[PDB]
Amino acid sequence: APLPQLRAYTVDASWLQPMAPLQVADHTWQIGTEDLTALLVQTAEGAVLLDGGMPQMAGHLLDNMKLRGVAPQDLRLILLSHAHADHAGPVAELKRRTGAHVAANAETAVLLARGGSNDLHFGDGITYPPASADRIIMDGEVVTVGGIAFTAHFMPGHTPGSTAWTWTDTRDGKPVRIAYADSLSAPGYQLKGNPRYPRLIEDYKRSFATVRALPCDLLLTPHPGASNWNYAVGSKASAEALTCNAYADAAEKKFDAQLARETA
Amino acid sequence: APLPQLRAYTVDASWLQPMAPLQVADHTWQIGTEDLTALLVQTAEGAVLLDGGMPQMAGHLLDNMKLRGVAPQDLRLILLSHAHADHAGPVAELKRRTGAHVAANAETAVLLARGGSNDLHFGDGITYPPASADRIIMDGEVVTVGGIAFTAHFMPGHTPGSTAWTWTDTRDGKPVRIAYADSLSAPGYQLKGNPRYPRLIEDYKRSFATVRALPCDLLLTPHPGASNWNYAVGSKASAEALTCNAYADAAEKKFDAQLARETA
Amino acid sequence: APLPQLRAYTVDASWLQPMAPLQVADHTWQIGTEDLTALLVQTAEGAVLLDGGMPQMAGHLLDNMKLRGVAPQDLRLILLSHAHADHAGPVAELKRRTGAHVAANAETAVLLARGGSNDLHFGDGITYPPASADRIIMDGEVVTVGGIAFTAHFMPGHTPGSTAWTWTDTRDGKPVRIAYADSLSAPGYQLKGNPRYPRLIEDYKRSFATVRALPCDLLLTPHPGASNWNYAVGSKASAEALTCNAYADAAEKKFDAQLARETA
Amino acid sequence: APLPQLRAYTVDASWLQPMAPLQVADHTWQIGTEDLTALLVQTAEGAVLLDGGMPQMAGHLLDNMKLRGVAPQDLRLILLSHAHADHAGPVAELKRRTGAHVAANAETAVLLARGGSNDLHFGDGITYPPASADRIIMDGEVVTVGGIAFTAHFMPGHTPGSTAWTWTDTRDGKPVRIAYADSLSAPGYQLKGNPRYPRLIEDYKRSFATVRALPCDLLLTPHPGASNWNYAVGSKASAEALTCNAYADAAEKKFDAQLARETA
Ligand SMILES: CO[C@@]1(NC(=O)[C@@H](C)C(=O)O)C(=O)N2C(C(=O)O)=C(C)CO[C@@H]21
Ligand SMILES: CO[C@@]1(NC(=O)[C@@H](C)C(=O)O)C(=O)N2C(C(=O)O)=C(C)CO[C@@H]21
Ligand SMILES: CO[C@@]1(NC(=O)[C@@H](C)C(=O)O)C(=O)N2C(C(=O)O)=C(C)CO[C@@H]21
Ligand SMILES: CO[C@@]1(NC(=O)[C@@H](C)C(=O)O)C(=O)N2C(C(=O)O)=C(C)CO[C@@H]21
Ligand SMILES: [Zn+2]
Ligand SMILES: [Zn+2]
Ligand SMILES: [Zn+2]
Ligand SMILES: [Zn+2]
Ligand SMILES: [Zn+2]
Ligand SMILES: [Zn+2]
Ligand SMILES: [Zn+2]
Ligand SMILES: [Zn+2]
């Protein structure tokens, strides 16, 4: 009886369904797929990319950046929510083909440095090509590119380096405060007494309060369904979107019920 | 039409067929599978592991080390031939569970650091968990562990960091010079005018002469069939084994014919 | 007028005054200098080193380990308080000459990876040879070596990766709870509105409460004077030592006065 | 008697004497100091920097790039000769403040990754802030930026990753072939039987032949005096400059005499 074969990381087909650039604000564009968020922010001095999706999406992101008139050498910075393969997949290839830098916190940098291997909950099952972080950022730090200020807010939980990014854009000249909050889920995580993450419950709870207090007029999440975004219906995508309170309060109820069912 | 799914790195079943420790010399043991070489060298001050095989072989290697009376903390050093997933797969997990160090040259270290991603010929198709090299070694350098001296011989070709290791063991008190030479194949490689490896032909040719001149009374290769080793027949495994000249001369004939067919 | 010359990191002479192993508990030994703490813990399966001091102390640490009958290959693990040159200096050389692994959190790992360069407060003025962390640890995680359990407690402040280590030893068979807390000082730090560390005050305050609640019957600090340890007087070294409450309460009073004087 | 203090890396004052941009060709500019070469190549799609000099020269390089009308975000690539502190010093700071990428071979990347520590000949005496290489290049590989092609030529000797860069510029429309060859010196190196570099003599000899055959109409070196460049006299700087043959033949005579005196 031979040893088992390696198994690839397969996802839903909608996660890999490419879409054209859907506009969020005057400078913010969704250029990922129907079920994976990849945000582009075009400024006067360059573009900024927030997350990238699956590893095989690198070419699709570049095609959509070309549609927005953004050349590869115009991408200045890559920001991340958390360093899992379904969000930070193409980061390594994007750095090679765009000449961009990656800014992330220490926890996301070390997870990105080993390509998602030795995950606290997933082990080596979800692995992507590794990449290095060029700039380490702290909680509440401000990253400015082309006059647009990106503020990081640590929200540990899904990964130890989970980060929410908030910035202020315009919509026909009216200022809108966009908050890109990371996921607050724990799919199959051992919450109680996890040796690889002893203070996991304290971090999740403290992150729920963090998401509630985010300066936010419009919320987006790495998975659009988590905040009731529907990238497929085009104009009416943000119709039934959730608030920061509604998103954090719904996520905490799921966390407590899962925590209660774990004690069984 | 969605983007294609990720595909895993599947191999022949014999590459994953575990085997018990087959003895090579007084201190050298094969503890891998039937078609993947993993050499253990037990010394008075600790053990040395040469290659590890597929990524899912980490547990099998530890079980065989236990059969030889080698505890995890007794593995002192990990040496490599080249940093591909079918040879350096479990290196990252082995470092975590054994407290061992990895010695490799600059070219193998950087390929091991990115887990085989961005391969010169394979791209991101064959990816394994990344690991870091603790000690960088040069061509002709001597690594000593427990009185046994391991000499490295650079043989660039299959990978830029392909390394042959030679050491002198005993067999019932009689000194035997064991040479562990890396593969000299180029499966699907573009040999002529490869932009990622311009001087590839010069390196292959120079490596053929290197393998011929290795101090060698017994030759082993990462794939046992490359030197006509048959780990399955136990005692008669080294019966029809090849010499250093026979192995290099057969590999060069295949390289030239492939090079001639490439010009077509 | 030429550009200014590089200036080395010079310290007090007592920081570099070697001392013989002074015993703390049945298994805990101070093997550093008179004004720099380097703790050795000898277990049945190997030794553990906590901090190392200045970069030029690597040879002195090895000599003292030899006096305790600890061979270089017997050092299994290196633990750190924070990755500054006066505490993590010889870590890179120690890893080369002992075959030991380093366990630290993400923030200490990335600072250790760049050798103290690009410090949040010191820039590139205090730089030491870089080293890599082999195992990343989380807050409250337990590291066990030879039956002795080391519990990490994150106390961000002096550096973002400042860590206190607590373990339970014996003293003539009587269990003693030793806590090795990191420094709580801010020599020349901008506390209010520091762009490289926006939430610095929140981390310092939260760390003061962390140090107070440490399970501790005997406290040691990277600088022995910070807890009124006097390694020079031998037996009477722990005579006037401070408690966890006394150490945290004295450090907070200095932090608030410095914070009040900063607002001037 | 306390342990000795750390000593900084002090150099000649002329190595730190800033100079204004002296023009080499239509697109090539020397923007370093009087005795340290730092070459800037302005193209239509961005600038390229070859070497940077001492670590404290980062601000001077940026000032000279501003004089050439090159903004920090316009520096696309950093190329190196070898990763010593007097040539790759400011690379880490330049990457932070310019958003540029670094391309170097495996041997230079690993030396740059540890900031010059654990040098084969210098140990930890010459240490600079570490930086990471974004793109690994092979011997004879071509790097193109803005239509200007940079060809790498490995010349191991001074360091294992010593690289000569050759490109073709214009001078009033007339094509000039510029070769930037690395140093061929061995100041205090043990040449014969060096355990850290066993095949050092073979690499030096093979590199002498490499420098002779470089396509070169104008030669520059990291230290301008090595090729009889005098950056101080402005226009007449390249007056008494050496050829590729003259530079390699003079360096080999010094190597053989030093090798003969070493055998004494
Ligand atoms: C590693 O990627 C994830 N997990 C998986 O794909 C497998 C392992 C699974 O358990 O379903 C992960 O985390 N995601 C999230 C998230 O909320 O971030 C959700 C909702 C589920 O999908 C991705
Ligand atoms: C990356 O692993 C290898 N390649 C593959 O598995 C695929 C990609 C394939 O082309 O067959 C690779 O190289 N090997 C060698 C070797 O000689 O080293 C041989 C003989 C073929 O198998 C492994
Ligand atoms: C980087 O090393 C330190 N700082 C210096 O040496 C210079 C920069 C200085 O400002 O005096 C640092 O932090 N230490 C601590 C500590 O409490 O950790 C104390 C008390 C002061 O000494 C070391
Ligand atoms: C590490 O920097 C160097 N060495 C020193 O500065 C000290 C250590 C010294 O031995 O003089 C080094 O190599 N250089 C070269 C070169 O040719 O590259 C020359 C000519 C001498 O200066 C620099
Ligand atoms: Zn995820
Ligand atoms: Zn996800
Ligand atoms: Zn291979
Ligand atoms: Zn193979
Ligand atoms: Zn400090
Ligand atoms: Zn200190
Ligand atoms: Zn040099
Ligand atoms: Zn030099």
Was C82 annotated as part of a binding site? yes
Phi, psi of C140 (to 5 degrees): 80, 5
For residue C172, the 8-state DSSP code is T
Nearest CA in chain C to B71: C45
* Crossing angle between the packed helical segments A58-67 and A91-98, to the nearest 10 degrees: 50
Would you give the distance in Å from CA C82 to the centre of its chain? 6
- Is the CB of residue A228 less than 8 Å from the CB of residue A246? no
Q: b/e for C209-231, b at 16 or more Cβ within 10 A?
A: ebbbebebbbbbbbebebbbbbb
What's the token pair of residue B264? Answer: 């077509």
Using only C-alpha atoms, chain D has a radius of gyration, in whole angstroms, of 18
The SS3 of residue C58 is helix
Nearest CA in chain A to B114: A130
Q: Under DSSP, is residue D137 helix (H, G, I), strand (E, B) or coil?
A: coil
Q: Which long-range contacts does A197-202 make (Cβ < 8 Å, 24+ apart)?
A: A197/A120, A197/A160, A197/C138, A198/C138, A198/C139, A198/C140, A198/C141, A198/C142, A199/C138, A199/C139, A199/C140, A200/A157, A201/A259
Phi/psi region, residue B14 (left: phi>0; alpha: psi -120 to 50; beta: rest), is alpha
Tell me if residue C173 falls in helix, strand or coil: coil
Is D136:D113 a contact under the CB 8 Å cutoff? no
Q: Report the distance separating Cα B180 and Cα B160, nearest Å.
A: 17
Catalytic residues of A: 82, 84, 86-87, 158, 189, 223
For residue D103, give Cα distances in angstroms to A25, A91, C166, D91, D119. Answer: 37, 18, 44, 11, 20
- In angstroms, what is the C-alpha Rg of chain C? 18
Q: Which residues contact D88 (CB under 8 A, 6 or more apart)?
A: D51, D52, D80, D82, D112, D116, D128, D131
Residues D157, A123: Cα–Cα separation, whole Å? 43
What is the helix (H) or strand (E) element at residue C165, kind and residue range?
strand C163-171
Quickly list DSSP for A5-63. Answer: PP------GGGG-B---EE-SSSEEE-SBSSS--EEEEETTEEEEE--BSGGGHHHHHH
* Residues in contact with A190: Cβ distance below 8 Å, sequence separation at least 6, in sequence order: A121, A262
3-state secondary structure labels for all residues of A90-152 = CHHHHHHHHCCEEEECHHHHHHHHCCCCCECCCECCCCCCCCCCCEECCCCCEEEECCEEEEE
SS3 D80: coil
CA distance B105 to B109: 6
Which structure tokens are listed for A139? 């909680």
CA of D187, closest atom in ligand 4: 10
Residue type, D131: A
Name the strands in the sheet holding B142-145, side by side, starting at the edge strand that comes first in the sequence: B142-145, B148-154, B163-171, B174-180, B218-220
CA atoms of D136 and D155, how far apart (whole Å): 16
Q: A191-226 in b/e burial notation, b at 16+ Cβ within 10 A?
A: beebeebbebbebbeebbebbbebebbbbbbbebeb
Tokens 């000797």: give the residue.
D157
Tokens of B55: 């990524």
Give the containing element (helix H, strand E) for A66: helix A58-67
CA of D86 from ligand 12 middle (Å) equals 6
Data resolution in angstroms: 2.2
Structure-token match 């975004």, residue found: A229
- D136, containing H or E segment: strand D135-136
Calculate the CA D40 to chain-centre distance. Answer: 12
Nearest to B188, CA basis, from B128, B252, B258: B258
Please write down the HEC assignment for all residues of chain B.
CCCCCCCCCCCCHHHHCECCCEECCCCEEECCECCCCCEEEEECCEEEEECCECHHHHHHHHHHHHHCCCCHHHEEEEECCCCCHHHHCCHHHHHHHHCCEEEECHHHHHHHHCCCCCECCCECCCCCCCCCCCEECCCCCEEEECCEEEEEEECCCCCCCCEEEEEEEEECCEEEEEEECCCCCCCCCCCCCECCECCHHHHHHHHHHHHHCCCCCEEECCCHHHHCCCHHHHHHHHCCCCCHHHHHHHHHHHHHHHHHHHCC
List Cα–Cα distances, A235 to A15, A21, A244, B28, in angstroms: 20, 12, 21, 68
- Give dist(CA A85, CA A83) in Å, integer: 7
β pairing state of A174-180 and A163-171: antiparallel
Experimental method: X-ray
**Residue numbers preceding breaks in chain A (C to N > 2.5 A):** none
Cβ atoms of D97 and D107 within 8 Å: the answer is: no
C93: left (phi over 0), alpha (psi -120 to 50) or beta: alpha
Q: List residues of chain B with CB under 8 Å from any CB of chain D.
A: 105-107, 109-110, 120, 136, 138-142, 160-161, 195-199
DSSP A200: H
Q: How many Cα atoms within 13 Å fall on the side-chain side of residue C187?
A: 2
Q: After which residues is chain C broken (C to N over 2.5 A)?
A: none
B101 labelled ligand-binding: no
Closest to D116 in 3D by CA, of D102, D129, D101, D135: D129
CB–CB of A214/A164 below 8 Å? yes
Q: Which two tokens stand for residue D90?
A: 């400011």
DSSP label at D104? Answer: E
| Greatest alpha-carbon span in chain A | 67
Instruction: Please name the member of D3, D9, D96 whose beta carbon is closest to the beta carbon of C16.
Output: D3
Pocket residues for ligand 4 (CB within 6 Å)?
D 84, 86, 122, 126, 158, 183, 185, 187-188, 222-223
Ligand (nearest to CA of D225): 4
DSSP C31: -
- Token pair, residue D79, equals 């190329």
Question: Which amino acid would we find at residue C188?
Answer: G
Give the DSSP letter string of C147-161. TEEEEEEE--SSSTT
Six token digits for residue B201: 């032909």
Write the DSSP symbol of residue C74.
G
Let me know: does D231 contact D22? Beta carbons within 8 Å. Answer: yes
Q: Which amino acid is at D132?
A: S
Closest to C23 in 3D by CA, of C35, C45, C40, C46? C40
Cβ–Cβ under 8 Å, residues A22 and A40: no
CB distance A54–B96 less than 8 Å?
A: no
Of the candidates C106, C139, C199, the beta carbon closest to that of A110 is on C106
The span from the CA of B226 to the CA of B244, in Å, is 11
Q: With contact defined as beta carbons under 8 Å apart, do A127 and B130 qualify?
A: no
Query: Is B153 marked as a binding-site residue?
Result: no
B139: nearest Cα among B174, B176, B99, B104: B104
| Chain-centre distance for alpha carbon C86 | 9
Inter-chain touch D76–A73, beta carbons under 8 Å: yes
Cβ(B155)–Cβ(B164) below 8 Å = yes
Q: How far apart are CA C99 and CA C96, in angstroms?
A: 6
Chains that touch A (3 or more CB pairs under 8 A): B, C, D
Identity (one letter) of the amino acid at A195? P
B72 burial level (CB within 10 Å; 0-12, 13-18, 19+):
middle
Q: Closest by alpha carbon to B103, among B40, B161, B170?
A: B161
Q: For the CA atoms of A22, A28, A34, A35, what is the dihedral angle to 10 degrees?
A: -160
Between helix D91-98 and helix D58-67 the angle, nearest 10°, is 50
Tell me the three state secondary structure of residue D253: helix
Burial code (b: 16+ CB inside 10 Å, e: under 16) for C123-138 equals ebebbbbbbbbbbbbb
Please, which residues bridge with residue C152 across strands?
C165
Widest Cα–Cα separation across chain B:
67
Q: What is the Cα–Cα distance from B242 to A251, expressed in whole angstroms?
A: 64
Q: In sequence order, which ranges of C82-154 are alpha helices (DSSP H)?
A: 85-88, 91-98, 106-113
